[PDB]
Enzyme design. Sequence first.
Site, PDB file in Angstrom:
ATOM      1  N   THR C  57       0.890  -1.158   0.000  1.00  0.00           N
ATOM      2  CA  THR C  57       0.000   0.000   0.000  1.00  0.00           C
ATOM      3  C   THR C  57       0.935   1.216   0.000  1.00  0.00           C
ATOM      4  OG1 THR C  57      -1.991   0.962   1.170  1.00  0.00           O
ATOM      5  CG2 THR C  57      -0.254   0.047   2.570  1.00  0.00           C
ATOM      6  N   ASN C 115      -2.005  -5.201 -11.877  1.00  0.00           N
ATOM      7  CA  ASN C 115      -1.564  -3.903 -11.413  1.00  0.00           C
ATOM      8  C   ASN C 115      -0.102  -3.493 -11.633  1.00  0.00           C
ATOM      9  OD1 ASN C 115      -2.379  -1.512  -9.626  1.00  0.00           O
ATOM     10  ND2 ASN C 115      -0.745  -2.414  -8.364  1.00  0.00           N
ATOM     11  N   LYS C 167     -10.700 -19.196 -47.244  1.00  0.00           N
ATOM     12  CA  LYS C 167     -10.398 -17.822 -47.636  1.00  0.00           C
ATOM     13  C   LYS C 167     -11.146 -17.545 -48.945  1.00  0.00           C
ATOM     14  CE  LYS C 167      -5.775 -17.331 -45.714  1.00  0.00           C
ATOM     15  NZ  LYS C 167      -6.276 -17.453 -44.317  1.00  0.00           N
ATOM     16  N   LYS C 169     -11.652 -14.709 -45.974  1.00  0.00           N
ATOM     17  CA  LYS C 169     -12.404 -14.787 -44.728  1.00  0.00           C
ATOM     18  C   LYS C 169     -13.790 -14.143 -44.865  1.00  0.00           C
ATOM     19  CE  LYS C 169      -8.857 -13.019 -42.638  1.00  0.00           C
ATOM     20  NZ  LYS C 169      -8.179 -12.777 -41.341  1.00  0.00           N
ATOM     21  N   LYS C 193     -11.730 -24.737 -41.565  1.00  0.00           N
ATOM     22  CA  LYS C 193     -11.864 -23.808 -40.476  1.00  0.00           C
ATOM     23  C   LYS C 193     -12.392 -22.413 -40.821  1.00  0.00           C
ATOM     24  CE  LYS C 193      -8.671 -21.372 -37.521  1.00  0.00           C
ATOM     25  NZ  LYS C 193      -8.869 -20.108 -38.210  1.00  0.00           N
ATOM     26  N   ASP C 195     -12.292 -18.441 -40.254  1.00  0.00           N
ATOM     27  CA  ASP C 195     -11.255 -17.513 -39.903  1.00  0.00           C
ATOM     28  C   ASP C 195     -11.644 -16.960 -38.530  1.00  0.00           C
ATOM     29  OD1 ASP C 195      -8.975 -15.720 -41.120  1.00  0.00           O
ATOM     30  OD2 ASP C 195     -10.339 -14.335 -40.055  1.00  0.00           O
ATOM     31  N   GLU C 196     -10.672 -16.432 -37.784  1.00  0.00           N
ATOM     32  CA  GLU C 196     -10.969 -15.882 -36.467  1.00  0.00           C
ATOM     33  C   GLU C 196     -11.982 -14.730 -36.534  1.00  0.00           C
ATOM     34  OE1 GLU C 196      -7.890 -15.649 -37.948  1.00  0.00           O
ATOM     35  OE2 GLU C 196      -7.243 -13.583 -37.899  1.00  0.00           O
ATOM     36  N   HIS C 286      -8.432 -20.243 -31.099  1.00  0.00           N
ATOM     37  CA  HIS C 286      -7.639 -19.370 -31.926  1.00  0.00           C
ATOM     38  C   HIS C 286      -7.058 -18.265 -31.009  1.00  0.00           C
ATOM     39  CE1 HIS C 286      -6.422 -16.486 -34.961  1.00  0.00           C
ATOM     40  NE2 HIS C 286      -6.524 -17.449 -35.864  1.00  0.00           N
ATOM     41  N   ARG C 287      -5.787 -17.919 -31.201  1.00  0.00           N
ATOM     42  CA  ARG C 287      -5.102 -16.938 -30.347  1.00  0.00           C
ATOM     43  C   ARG C 287      -5.062 -15.484 -30.834  1.00  0.00           C
ATOM     44  NH1 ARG C 287       1.415 -18.201 -30.581  1.00  0.00           N
ATOM     45  NH2 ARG C 287       1.652 -18.091 -32.862  1.00  0.00           N
ATOM     46  N   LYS C 326      12.327 -19.016 -38.773  1.00  0.00           N
ATOM     47  CA  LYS C 326      12.963 -18.438 -37.596  1.00  0.00           C
ATOM     48  C   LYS C 326      14.174 -19.247 -37.227  1.00  0.00           C
ATOM     49  CE  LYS C 326       9.176 -18.548 -35.562  1.00  0.00           C
ATOM     50  NZ  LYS C 326       7.905 -18.616 -34.737  1.00  0.00           N
ATOM     51  N   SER C 371       0.346 -23.000 -38.095  1.00  0.00           N
ATOM     52  CA  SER C 371      -0.361 -22.305 -39.166  1.00  0.00           C
ATOM     53  C   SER C 371       0.378 -21.029 -39.584  1.00  0.00           C
ATOM     54  CB  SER C 371      -1.758 -21.948 -38.634  1.00  0.00           C
ATOM     55  OG  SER C 371      -2.507 -21.142 -39.519  1.00  0.00           O
ATOM     56  N   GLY C 373       1.508 -19.309 -43.597  1.00  0.00           N
ATOM     57  CA  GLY C 373       2.380 -19.332 -44.756  1.00  0.00           C
ATOM     58  C   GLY C 373       3.073 -20.635 -45.100  1.00  0.00           C
ATOM     59  N   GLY C 396      -3.771 -20.735 -47.622  1.00  0.00           N
ATOM     60  CA  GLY C 396      -3.305 -20.456 -48.975  1.00  0.00           C
ATOM     61  C   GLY C 396      -2.612 -21.686 -49.546  1.00  0.00           C
TER      62      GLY C 396
HETATM   63  O1  LIG Z   1      -6.145  -0.129  -5.468  1.00  0.00           O
HETATM   64  C1  LIG Z   1      -6.077   0.936  -6.115  1.00  0.00           C
HETATM   65  C2  LIG Z   1      -5.590   2.237  -5.467  1.00  0.00           C
HETATM   66  O2  LIG Z   1      -5.362   2.286  -4.032  1.00  0.00           O
HETATM   67  P1  LIG Z   1      -4.798   3.623  -3.345  1.00  0.00           P
HETATM   68  O3  LIG Z   1      -6.079   4.587  -3.402  1.00  0.00           O
HETATM   69  O4  LIG Z   1      -4.504   3.339  -1.941  1.00  0.00           O
HETATM   70  O5  LIG Z   1      -3.761   4.192  -4.201  1.00  0.00           O
HETATM   71  C3  LIG Z   1      -6.548   1.052  -7.621  1.00  0.00           C
HETATM   72  O6  LIG Z   1      -7.154  -0.131  -8.002  1.00  0.00           O
HETATM   73  C4  LIG Z   1      -5.424   1.333  -8.619  1.00  0.00           C
HETATM   74  O7  LIG Z   1      -4.841   2.562  -8.340  1.00  0.00           O
HETATM   75  C5  LIG Z   1      -5.911   1.347 -10.081  1.00  0.00           C
HETATM   76  O8  LIG Z   1      -4.944   1.208 -11.135  1.00  0.00           O
HETATM   77  P2  LIG Z   1      -5.144   1.903 -12.605  1.00  0.00           P
HETATM   78  O9  LIG Z   1      -5.484   3.409 -12.243  1.00  0.00           O
HETATM   79  O10 LIG Z   1      -3.811   1.860 -13.314  1.00  0.00           O
HETATM   80  O11 LIG Z   1      -6.353   1.316 -13.247  1.00  0.00           O
HETATM   81  O1  LIG Z   2      -5.432 -17.405 -41.341  1.00  0.00           O
HETATM   82  C1  LIG Z   2      -4.406 -17.973 -40.912  1.00  0.00           C
HETATM   83  C2  LIG Z   2      -3.369 -18.580 -41.864  1.00  0.00           C
HETATM   84  O2  LIG Z   2      -3.655 -18.655 -43.288  1.00  0.00           O
HETATM   85  P1  LIG Z   2      -2.558 -19.236 -44.306  1.00  0.00           P
HETATM   86  O3  LIG Z   2      -2.610 -20.807 -43.983  1.00  0.00           O
HETATM   87  O4  LIG Z   2      -3.037 -19.036 -45.673  1.00  0.00           O
HETATM   88  O5  LIG Z   2      -1.243 -18.734 -43.919  1.00  0.00           O
HETATM   89  C3  LIG Z   2      -4.125 -18.174 -39.368  1.00  0.00           C
HETATM   90  O6  LIG Z   2      -5.233 -17.771 -38.646  1.00  0.00           O
HETATM   91  C4  LIG Z   2      -2.922 -17.397 -38.835  1.00  0.00           C
HETATM   92  O7  LIG Z   2      -1.761 -17.832 -39.461  1.00  0.00           O
HETATM   93  C5  LIG Z   2      -2.738 -17.549 -37.312  1.00  0.00           C
HETATM   94  O8  LIG Z   2      -1.918 -16.596 -36.614  1.00  0.00           O
HETATM   95  P2  LIG Z   2      -1.062 -16.993 -35.275  1.00  0.00           P
HETATM   96  O9  LIG Z   2      -0.284 -18.299 -35.724  1.00  0.00           O
HETATM   97  O10 LIG Z   2      -0.062 -15.887 -35.031  1.00  0.00           O
HETATM   98  O11 LIG Z   2      -2.015 -17.390 -34.202  1.00  0.00           O
HETATM   99 CA   LIG Z   3      -6.984 -16.413 -39.919  1.00  0.00          CA
END
Ligand SMILES: O=C(COP(=O)(O)O)[C@H](O)[C@H](O)COP(=O)(O)O
Ligand SMILES: O=C(COP(=O)(O)O)[C@H](O)[C@H](O)COP(=O)(O)O
Ligand SMILES: [Ca+2]
Lengths: 123, 455, 455, 455, 151, 158
Positions: C57, C115, C167, C169, C193, C195-196, C286-287, C326, C371, C373, C396
């Site tokens: 705190t 935080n 594709k 998408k 699949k 697409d996202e 999907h990420r 890579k 996935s 290229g 592709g």
């Molecule tokens: O717990 C507290 C503050 O406690 P104190 O009042 O004792 O400072 C808040 O959640 C953060 O400050 C928010 O962070 P952000 O502003 O970056 O969203």
């Molecule tokens: O659409 C595609 C690929 O299409 P292609 O097969 O034609 O390349 C995938 O969603 C991404 O590559 C994922 O991204 P990440 O791997 O960064 O999650």
């Molecule tokens: Ca995609």
Amino acid sequence: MQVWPILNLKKYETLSYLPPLTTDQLARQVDYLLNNKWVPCLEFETDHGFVYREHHNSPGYYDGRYWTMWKLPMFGCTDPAQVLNELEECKKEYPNAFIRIIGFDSNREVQCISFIAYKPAGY
Amino acid sequence: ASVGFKAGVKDYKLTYYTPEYETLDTDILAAFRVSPQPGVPPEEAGAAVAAESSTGTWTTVWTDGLTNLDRYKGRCYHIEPVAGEENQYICYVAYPLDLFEEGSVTNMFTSIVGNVFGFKALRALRLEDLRIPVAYVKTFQGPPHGIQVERDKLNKYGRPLLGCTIKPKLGLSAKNYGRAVYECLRGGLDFTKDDENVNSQPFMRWRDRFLFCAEALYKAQAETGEIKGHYLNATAGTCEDMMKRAVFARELGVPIVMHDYLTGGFTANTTLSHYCRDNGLLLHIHRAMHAVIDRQKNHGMHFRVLAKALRLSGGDHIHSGTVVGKLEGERDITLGFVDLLRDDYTEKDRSRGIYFTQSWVSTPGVLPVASGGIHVWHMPALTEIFGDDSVLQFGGGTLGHPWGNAPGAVANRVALEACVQARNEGRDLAREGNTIIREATKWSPELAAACEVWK
Amino acid sequence: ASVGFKAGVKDYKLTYYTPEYETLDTDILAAFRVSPQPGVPPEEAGAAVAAESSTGTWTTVWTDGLTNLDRYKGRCYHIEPVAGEENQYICYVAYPLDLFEEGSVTNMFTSIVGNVFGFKALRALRLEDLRIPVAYVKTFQGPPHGIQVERDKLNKYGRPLLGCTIKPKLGLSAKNYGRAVYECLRGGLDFTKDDENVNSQPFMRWRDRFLFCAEALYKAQAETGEIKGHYLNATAGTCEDMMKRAVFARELGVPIVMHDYLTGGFTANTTLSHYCRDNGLLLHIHRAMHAVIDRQKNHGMHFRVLAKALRLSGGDHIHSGTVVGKLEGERDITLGFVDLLRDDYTEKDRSRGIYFTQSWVSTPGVLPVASGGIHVWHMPALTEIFGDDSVLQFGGGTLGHPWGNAPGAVANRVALEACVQARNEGRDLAREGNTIIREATKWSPELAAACEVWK
Amino acid sequence: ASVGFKAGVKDYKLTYYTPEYETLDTDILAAFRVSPQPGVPPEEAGAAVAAESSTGTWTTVWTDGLTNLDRYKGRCYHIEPVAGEENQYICYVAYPLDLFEEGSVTNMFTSIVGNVFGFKALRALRLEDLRIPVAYVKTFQGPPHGIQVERDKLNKYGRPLLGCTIKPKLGLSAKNYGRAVYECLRGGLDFTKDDENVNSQPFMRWRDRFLFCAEALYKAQAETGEIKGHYLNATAGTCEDMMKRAVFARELGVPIVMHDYLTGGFTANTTLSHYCRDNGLLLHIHRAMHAVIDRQKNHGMHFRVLAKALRLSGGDHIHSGTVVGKLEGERDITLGFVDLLRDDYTEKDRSRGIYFTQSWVSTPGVLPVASGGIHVWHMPALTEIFGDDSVLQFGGGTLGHPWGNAPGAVANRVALEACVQARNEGRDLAREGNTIIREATKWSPELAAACEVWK
Amino acid sequence: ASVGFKAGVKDYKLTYYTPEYETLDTDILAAFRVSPQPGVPPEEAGAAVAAESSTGTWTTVWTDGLTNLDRYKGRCYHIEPVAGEENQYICYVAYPLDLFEEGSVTNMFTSIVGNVFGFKALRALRLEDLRIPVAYVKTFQGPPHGIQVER
Amino acid sequence: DKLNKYGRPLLGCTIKPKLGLSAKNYGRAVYECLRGGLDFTKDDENVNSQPFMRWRDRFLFCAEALYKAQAETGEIKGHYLNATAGTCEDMMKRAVFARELGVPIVMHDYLTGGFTANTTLSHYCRDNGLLLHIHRAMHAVIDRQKNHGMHFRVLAKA
Ligand SMILES: O=C(COP(=O)(O)O)[C@H](O)[C@H](O)COP(=O)(O)O
Ligand SMILES: O=C(COP(=O)(O)O)[C@H](O)[C@H](O)COP(=O)(O)O
Ligand SMILES: [Ca+2]
Ligand SMILES: O=C(COP(=O)(O)O)[C@H](O)[C@H](O)COP(=O)(O)O
Ligand SMILES: [Ca+2]
Ligand SMILES: [Ca+2]
Ligand SMILES: [Ca+2]
């Protein structure tokens, strides 16, 4: 180390934690409204000057938020004296009521201010 | 689009860099801060950002001929160098209205920011701003209540609202936690709050906390006569658990719940926002995890983008940081996204980091919450910077007062009201702040005690 | 903890830097890459990271005396310099089991990462790894099915699974989209699949897409005799819309749905994961948006942390990028988090970016999805790097084949089977990859056609 | 595990007796008191107990080769003779975490105790203790509230709680039953209670009883100003009937319900425990039928095992018998399982029947309930033995007072408070108990009247 | 909007006939075929149609001062004679986006057509066309399937 | 009989301006009207749910206002809460909240809402003890001209 009192310490929102406003201070708050083009209006309450819950309990529902309007908002009012004269008429008629000054901002289309201007004896 | 097939790689550039493009009022516009790899010219980088966040494929596919891809592509229509940075540019990209699912911030972010940040031709990438067209804005509910309605429900006018985060976040039992809540509220603060971390844990299960906090808040409300609230944290592991928590808050008749929108996620946040609107609950939004994304200037997403998204998904309050402890510019940037959260219309202003003019077609504004190491001495500054429509939160600034929570609360409420009265009388908060505070200590022992402890 | 109050600021350092601390098997451990501001010594920075992500705190509060804060504080127990970086250190922090809500990845991230990233004493901060204790691992469901069960449901053994993203998408109508799906699956790919970005949009509403994709997949399954699937994207704006989508997939009797876990969010993801387990649906994750957080080495969160979180919340597949294009090291880092996704136990190994030994106490493994290229020529490499338990996706690389989707699919399936057979015969994929592919072109016109187009 | 098949019987011994085994922190450990048949050596018996409660089959089966059975077998890792008993040993058995369903006490008992007790090579078998690893403990909810929360909800501190079972159990009408309840509570007792037999019967249907008991308890609470409760028995024939009963208690706004966990069963008990947590109801657990299982020293299950199971499944109170009327040792054994019910950590202590060190990783403690032939004269003893965290119940000790229920209650409340005050002043309850009681009779006619009737 | 009250009837005309108005892309525009009663000039009729389908009141009310009614009024911004018809005109009226409930055709018709057709100053009235702005169009689902999907 | 009002016409007042007031200022107007002796106040036919005044907020403030006026005068009061909406589901949500508030009367624009929705709301009001005020918005589009359309007496029987 002082202990914040518990009895008869009811408050009335904005400016109620300050010492009661003098006529000059009161007039200065009214000028703030006028200078911002906000419409002043007075409200009074004789029964419960604080929030309570009698008719319903769902979120956001409270009774006691609405008070009764003293006359009408003071459209075109340009002098703090007009407002304060009304506060006097109101006090004359309801010496037992809490009176507050509120203001309306017709551009934001909402009530925008509210401060206690008079509390009956022993409050 | 279209074909005469013949498989093979091919090149972007001409297709995605459209410097002659006139944007449509229905387009979603993005301002990306692009840091290309050495050797990649700006036009090439901008075109890559557009292709990589829309229709660009690594090798020609025959299906493109079954549509008109021009109608669906993202277009880099403008590029401008960043001053004081070598090889860094602002590239503007336009996305057609049709690429997005209505009412889905989840889909808006997936489409614009879901893929481009990992493109090898770029060293770094940061989304600075988005122009959300009014036709897309109309597909969202926006805040369950918003500024105007919140003040009307609470009957609080003409001054910033005041809150206090209960500390320590973890360790207190539900009952001792509620005791702290009652002592804080009875002193004049409008709200108390659960830390972003406080959900449901071994020493304090959520239902017990909600229950004791309800007892505490009702007791403080009855004592003072002013409406009180406690941000009950509904953030949970699943949608079902989050809803169970919101439902109990409804049963208790309390006024406000809380959600960590980034760690909970936009899909869950929109669900909770819709529930709050249907049930009359105010929704306080905590921005936990934001700095993981918005801190670095060269990569991530600026907070103004995360703030617009929240205004669309829905929230009545949102943490916006303190303007304290930082130089102008950063002060200007904050004031800039504050306007973006509260107002109906904000004109483009690069001096404040506003890359696009933004209209909200009456979508309610969100109350910004100033929090973080603040105490009584920052009051004139905070009031000056944020104005009335803000929530000032004091955790350590309240629970750290020498006489306890209640006097800690009184000190903050008096300090704030002294500033409001002074400003209203025409006094200059920027120049006379310290004098306004000192005069109040003359008649407020609670405030005088606080002033002695801090700064 | 405890007191003899007396309000006021005070100092962290001694309290949060505990170099003598012996970690408990129940503690959650974090490895943070800390870049302190100039003038802040390492011990001071580490102590700040611990305090700022737990009980620290800014000013002493009296309530600390109502608990034993030592039992709840985060502790920096070790610090080590980063080689080849000035003023950059790895600080290890231990968090007690009691700080976390059971089964909530949302609460785990809020507590550790909610935080600290904005602390002024730090220039930058990156979470590199988390040691999740087995007692916390047991509070999560984990994958709805996992590697072993998925192969058993699908009856697919001894080779990587193969997929293809449809594709473009956006732009195709639901029916033309389904036509592409059927042509891809009938050629030998196991999955197709969404697409996202494909959720529900003006030109292709979700229900119509799900319906035509079902017709296409059943037709391809009946034709080939092999089980097929199409990742139906259930990502939506609210929990309610997401559930509606999953429910229709269930009604259709199809095998797999998809969710963008970061843009949808962990709260919604855990809900969908629980539903998939209860209804026998595989879940492809999907990420999208990961690079906004995990790309820069000095700030954000490394993907291995986002992968552990997904294994806890739940998913049967997760995109892990390609190791192609890579250098080693980045290759080693990928192989490192791949082990963390699939295995039951992974020993600490700094050469692969594994900062903590991690046990999973039989929580099912997640299938990594390569996935981006890739085409037929990367096949020997991918098979060598990922092994059998992986999904190789060719967007592709399939729709870009000169003769169409079906031959595009055949080319990929033949190329993969040629590599698997060769590896099984003892051939060295690393040395003989190109020769293995070329020999297959002699009897596969489809493969020969593809080989001509790419690399 | 594995094979080279060839069907046929075979022998245990070597496979299940693993004296060199080092237990894992994730293993569930069992201490069995084994009485082998004449001619069966100890190692042989221990191996049989392990095989018979895990993977031992009477004849080789080919499927064992499809797994690694070593990973799943129970292992007898230690054996030690029992003093003063011929041919009786304590055999320790370790079971891998993976054999058990998470959160299911039903599955835990089925796996360990479901089969071995009938093995012919054994004359008798008794399970004395189980070491439940913290990773398994984390899969259970545990008590709906527990000691700390219960006291906070009830606002009762610094003394044992007091209850009274209404008698006769059967025969009174719901209204006369409620009259007895009101007279008992108004005199100073905190709770009244339904006998374990009182569910729903011809002369007193459950709903009528719940309703009159509610009227009685509210009247006693209004009169005294102290919070009161009545353990409303929800034990029923089906899960549906049990839930109907709990639901009405919720509707009445009362604080506590009751369940006979052994006759109702663990599956139903866990359901009721989860409901109580979700609805804020305290749960009193009655141990009816325990002596059928835990009484004999050579066969059955010791009560400490049934108490651990209840702490996992869930209950806020549990009957633990009186320490009165028994010699030390039995006194020590009781104090031993009392620690196991209340504390977070209990170290191994054979003098108290604690065979394993047990940690609970913050799972709430359970309040032990002393009941059975006790009256005012046992008060100093009970207070000394159990301490503050206990519930002392007086059925005949209250309804048997010459002036009625109310004075009967006053006598018990005064007697208890006299002891608490004395102990707090430093008086020795063990030595001065009778003197402390006698002094109180000087000013309490109610207590004096009771003292005349008993002992 | 606003005041300095003083109760009493008053006149529309100047307030609702805004021939200089430039329509917003968010406005809902209506083309009404107006047949005024004899003696009512076109500008007067157009102004009546606008007032009567939005904020026009028969007598001044004090509450108008609590808002900015200009932001909510319907405006007759153009009038053109109908050929081959005596005393018949096409009056164009603009309605602000904010007057309508999202996704509700029921509310759209109630607001535009719910009251004006009975105004005594008019002999007859016909709504010929409405320009629905794209921001309002986006609040509706539209056809469950539509032409392309149906085929 | 429910209202306990006999021997005289009942009196109401439509709150104006229809659009523009915030839910709270709207409720203030309602309380001042009712306390003076009118039996009912009313939502304009156009007031359903809009950007500056969402329906739930209006229903809530109108409830506070009407209960305060009833307590002050001792006479039973009502406010016609407009339940007209875009779908049957939204209309029902509105009627249900009025029921929850314990208020006496709701309103529906039967011609713009339509007969199918009106009959649903009518059945709900009977089952829940709610009075139903019907507004005839759009009637003149149909009943004004003597030579074509439908006379209002037919729309009244329906
Ligand atoms: O717990 C507290 C503050 O406690 P104190 O009042 O004792 O400072 C808040 O959640 C953060 O400050 C928010 O962070 P952000 O502003 O970056 O969203
Ligand atoms: O659409 C595609 C690929 O299409 P292609 O097969 O034609 O390349 C995938 O969603 C991404 O590559 C994922 O991204 P990440 O791997 O960064 O999650
Ligand atoms: Ca995609
Ligand atoms: O009815 C009573 C006691 O009545 P009285 O107070 O009049 O003795 C209790 O249920 C049993 O003692 C419990 O048995 P166990 O302790 O073996 O669970
Ligand atoms: Ca916080
Ligand atoms: Ca009994
Ligand atoms: Ca009207």
